[PDB]
Amino acid sequence: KESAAAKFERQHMDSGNSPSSSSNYCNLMMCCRKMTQGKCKPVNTFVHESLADVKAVCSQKKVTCKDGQTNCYQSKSTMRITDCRETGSSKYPNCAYKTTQVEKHIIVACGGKPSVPVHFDASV
Template identity: 30%
Template sequence: KPKEDREWEKFKTKHITSQSVADFNCNRTMNDPAYTPDGQCKPVNTFIHSTTGPVKEICRRATGRVNKSSTQQFTLTTCKNPIRCKYSQSNTTNFICITCRDNYPVHFVKTGKC
């Protein structure tokens, strides 16, 4: 697989969820081995409640490596400040800033416009 595809697959796993806000649980999700590759709790992670299409659309016509803002707002859940891997959870609706590499989202930069 090309590098972009691998990075996009990783981005989807780390940042896109099909679960509703009501069903989403930071502790259950963040303690999954996919999010703790080195056995450490990740300090913060933002999840986008969406299908992959609208997120990938942000990177359409993005050549090279560039940060892009979404034109639509997404429902987001941020898991942060773990104390012994127990997370606080906050939900917002906002634009997102992501890094695109050749039409693929590869990194979540921040909540809000770039």
């Protein structure tokens, strides 16, 4: 199976099922992922929208990343990002996230050959 971009997709681009119990949804995702091991990731801005959209975005408007090496692209469109932030009475090991869904622009880091989405640079 593909890695890097599929790996990114799995880790971040969670175009999952209809939203319900958003806290639990996201807690479940990252708990299952286990990136909470030892230290709890402070925020994860899971893009809850179609991979085709994100790929299109990956070849929309390139912007100069805060690297001058990574080639990252803004989405002309806005899209539902799920900013899960460790706030829902977060107390290690009881890491519990406040699942903020919000619809705004994403900044995807494109890479590989062909140019595929490999990291989440930011959003605005």
